[PDB]
Symmetry: D2
Subunit: 333 residues, 4 copies
């Protein structure tokens, strides 16, 4: 495969490493995290409150992190410019620290000998891609790219199927979203976004999300036709998209289901899922889909105005898409 | 003031009793609950995990419950027909067990001498009223009435203001709702509502709600123009309405804020609130409003298609509305 | 392998069924639960908020619950005297409803053709057993037995090792315990035990437990030398034992560690575990041990006065021990 | 009343301010925090997820934080030696950042013109005081003091009563402790305390505490006779001390209750509380006691070996003790 270095060994960094090592679709050869040393990396990778103990062996050997017998070079650079990616043989770097989302900042890795960078977040100026939706618009000239956000990877496949078949005239989305590392256990400082500092385990917290507008970038005909917002709620993982949209062509709810179900069995297999079961959020913990349409939870007001519900494991589904994107890029070289 | 019996000393029964006692609009004179004996009522009224210790005295004396020096007759009847309301002097009865919501069942209280019954829940056939929206359409021939649901009591005053000023062509609603007594601590049997049995503290749980349709009964012009659904999430109190609606007349977001703020200061004062602060759900705990508009959390895609956010303490706001409705009804005797 | 019937398809009944299947030690041939119809059992067995989706197939077919292709007979009787266990071939019945814990009540299963009953909880009069501690005291005259509680199955193996090497003069135990089905989502009625009705998601809740005393029954020499209590805290699963005990023979803390480590690799392997990792409760979710010693978490005041810490998955470890006890009983036949 | 400056507007500094204003025992005249603008201070003081909205008026006016009409000078100094306490009239300074807990660091505030410094945390080298237990050991030569920790303030009053009357031969403590600002919302990096980084809302987490050893300095006769540890649990606030101790003189449990009750009504009034009710943790939210003994939750094994339970609001009880300690110091000047 392509040899991958991971910058930022957090929720996404470690679950991208889990998906890479377990799927075998790419090879992790290096990790950088100045806040997690090699022995700490062993513990943080082995144990996971949300996805359970890693099924396999992980150890420290001669200064390397050894996962299922295979060594991984470890870096401790706060400055992404000083990471010697080339010497470790890492061709692609996953930028998952949360603090290098612009091309200028994410371009640091190229200096170390990396050849392309995949920002595990929206970017102000890097080209953004959602597997199943616009990844074929990638081309080899793009050395710095973004895999958008979890919420965008949930909404864009759904919005693609609804728009392709019935036309979205306009839509508004809410995501009811699990807590993340940027939140606080008790009321604490968060100077730019005051509500995000309030106690994550106590509160429903409204928050902004660019995910709906960003869908207008991965689906250009939806530009200006979608926006939305978010609620953070006290669950540790798994989120859900609630898309209220008005349709061009009339659609009985059973045709929406039928069309969404066909897409989940066809080209969006593994990316867009479909279910009619009485599911709840924990039923999608460690599910690798980008988006699972929840037939029974949605509701139509009429044939042109509907509320559609789609679940996503915001940690693990997104991490698998990071791997899929990199594998697609490597196949295009 | 009217004298009141409370049937069902649960979350709503006890909080109706709080709001009545320390606001002097009505007088609780009797309570029936066959699963809470007198001494247990002292303890359950005294302490509240959500709203804090009762501020006042509560004791058991001569077989009655005495709150701030005022004795309350205590019954232990599983069947409402056997409650001697009249002999206790309860003129109105708050039906807050959750299992007598039809006119046939709630009417059992009139056999014990009660004059009128206020069901603390939507009713399949009893007329439904929301303070500030349609309570003046009540008339004195109605011996059995419903105070709708807490979600209807949050959505309807907002919908009234929006529809009065701009016309709601159509709307879809989501309520992100706190846990209630009908849910389960761990995955367990829940009759035919299978999702409602799943662990309340672990899950985001989609659920059905009539509230948006019931708005079409409370605001006739909106009949068939609103529906919606709910997500139960792990908080113990306080919920929020997310109304996505299409407007007939174009409205800038700042014009929406203007009319809502003005309504909150005029005829809907104390029922509909308005805020521009960076609030989260806990900021409405023990808030007696039916609906507080949250200016900053909402978002407009354009001048005719907007997402509006309104907070509600589903426990204490509704319970004050139950008192207000009975005081209003009493004022028309 | 012995054919087993399950009375009460709850947390324990369902995880005993998972454990039976995952381990092959017994064969579930029938299940009784009047509150969970056949199609509903498919769903409750398949989806699990705590332990994840069932790994295998489960379907309803021709009136039977079919798990991994094996059909299981389904009863729907509230009264155990009416379950036709013998018609289904069930020799042992797991009594896991929580309402038939005496020998009189559990004995109803013998009227239906069951040969033995294993009560999934402490019993007032049925003999109680803890795998690895006193299960060899079981003999074939015992047609009704108790597998004690999960807290006893955690405390007793540890207490046995400690007492056999240094002698426990006296000890007091706290278990910090996850929430269970008997608790309430919000402050509600709990007539017998007032604290157990307070909202489980909000509260540290003191609770009684006879578990440490029950160790005096399974380890006779410790009779009257152990008692304890519990705190119910807001987690969905996994609990921890905190044993403060005085020792007759002096022991350095690393003598304690080494003796427990040896026991966990010898005759108590699979029952008592040992770790020095910086674990937290979620690291034992879905762990089959009765009791895992946490070396780093305990602390000694001196060589004779120590506080020892041991983790237990209260759902899954206990369920595996029920299966283990039935399999041991079968080999004695 | 003494005029007080507050360094750090985190939970402690804010709740100390609430306590000071609500009790009128001292006057806040100045606040320093370089990470929080004045308008953010208004918001953070006004809204509190745990203790509810401030009951009073909070606004910014001419660069000052005006609480109930009284203005308060605001500083934004990185370095405490640069804060100008003197010109603000601040005589005592609460050092509530957590990083200036030594006498050398805390003394910096003396360079700004403050007369005394009260560290709101344990100190390596400043004398630690527990109100009600050893505050008689304060003298006017002490310019820098510590109020110890909230757990120390729970345990020491209870230990004193029990050791004064029966003699603690040796004791082992566990505190079951609510979530704090040092924890993480999801599994994240946590320096050398690996367990503290695991998801706070999901886990029961073992932790260290110096509180038991500190009580052996607050009460010198107990030096080397107490040690302990903590479990971090998923609640927002309120903790509980679990003290298992051996008594020199034998005591019936009703003897223990009687002397504790007697101390709570006498010299430890308002510091040590006493209850026999079926309390749970939320019943002590915003309670100003250091320690409330829970008669029904404890258990005696015999007359020389007991487990004693005492509740503390780890946020608000401690904050009120900071104010009382300052008022006590001011009365000795
Ligand atoms: N639901 C999700 O969790 C999710 C989904 C998609 C995208 N993202 C995005 O992924 C990015 C990281 O998310 P996360 O959830 O994994 O957060 P995280 O905090 O758990 O992990 C970020 C990691 O980066 C490390 N780090 C910090 N600074 C670093 C630096 N200079 N150099 C190297 N490592 C550094 C940190 O120690 C940490 O381990 C963010 O942009 C996030 O918005 C999160
Ligand atoms: N946020 C809310 O909780 C909320 C808000 C508005 C309306 N409601 C509705 O109010 C009703 C009660 O809800 P709740 O939250 O207070 O639930 P709850 O379980 O806390 O209270 C129900 C009470 O009814 C008692 N009871 C049961 N059967 C009885 C009988 N035959 N006779 C007398 N008493 C009996 C029960 O002991 C219990 O105390 C429901 O219909 C509910 O949907 C709830
Ligand atoms: N951590 C644990 O949950 C745990 C551990 C060890 C032991 N136990 C004990 O096991 C027993 C059950 O515990 P649980 O957590 O599984 O409770 P649960 O509520 O999850 O399951 C109880 C099941 O019994 C069913 N039931 C009720 N009445 C019945 C009847 N007449 N006939 C047949 N079925 C009936 C119920 O529908 C329910 O599904 C209790 O005694 C408990 O204390 C529980
Ligand atoms: C990063 O993962 C997410 O959940 C996306 C939310 C968001 O960033 O809105 C665009
Ligand atoms: C009682 O208040 C609510 O729970 C609102 C939900 C509802 O009942 O739907 C109409
Ligand atoms: C399974 O539940 C428990 O562990 C505690 C119950 C108890 O009292 O112990 C005998």
């Amino acid at each position: 495969m392509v040899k991958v270095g991971v910058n930022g060994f957090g929720r996404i960094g470690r679950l991208v490493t889990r998906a890479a090592i377990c799927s075998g679709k790419v090879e992790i050869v290096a990790i950088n995290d100045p806040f997690i040393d090699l022995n700490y990396m062993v513990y943080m990778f082995q144990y996971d409150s949300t996805h359970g103990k890693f099924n396999g062996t992980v150890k420290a050997e001669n200064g390397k992190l050894v996962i299922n017998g295979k060594p991984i070079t470890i870096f401790q650079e706060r400055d992404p410019t000083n990471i010697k990616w080339g010497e470790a043989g890492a061709e692609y770097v996953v930028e998952s620290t949360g603090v290098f989302t612009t091309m200028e900042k994410a371009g640091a890795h190229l200096k170390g000998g990396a050849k392309r960078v995949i920002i595990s977040a929206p970017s102000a100026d890097a080209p953004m891609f959602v597997m199943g939706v616009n990844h074929e618009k990638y081309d080899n000239s793009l050395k710095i790219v973004s895999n958008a956000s979890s919420t965008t990877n949930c909404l864009a496949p759904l919005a693609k199927v609804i728009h392709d078949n019935f036309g979205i005239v306009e839509g508004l989305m809410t995501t009811v979203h699990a807590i993340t590392a940027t939140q606080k256990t008790v009321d604490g400082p968060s100077g730019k976004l005051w509500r995000d500092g309030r106690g994550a385990a106590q509160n429903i917290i409204p928050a902004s999300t660019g995910a709906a507008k960003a869908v207008g970038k991965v689906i250009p005909e939806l530009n200006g036709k979608l926006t939305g917002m978010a609620f953070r709620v006290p669950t540790p993982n798994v989120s859900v998209v609630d898309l209220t949209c008005r349709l061009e062509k009339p659609a009985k709810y059973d045709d929406i289901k039928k069309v969404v179900k066909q897409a989940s069995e066809g080209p969006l297999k593994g990316i867009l899922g479909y279910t009619e079961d009485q599911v709840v959020s924990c039923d999608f913990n460690s599910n690798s889909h980008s988006s699972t349409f929840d037939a029974g939870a949605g509701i139509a007001l009429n044939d042109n105005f509907v509320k559609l519900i789609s679940w996503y494991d915001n940690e693990y589904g997104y991490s698998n898409r990071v791997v899929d994107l990199m594998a697609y890029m490597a196949s295009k070289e």
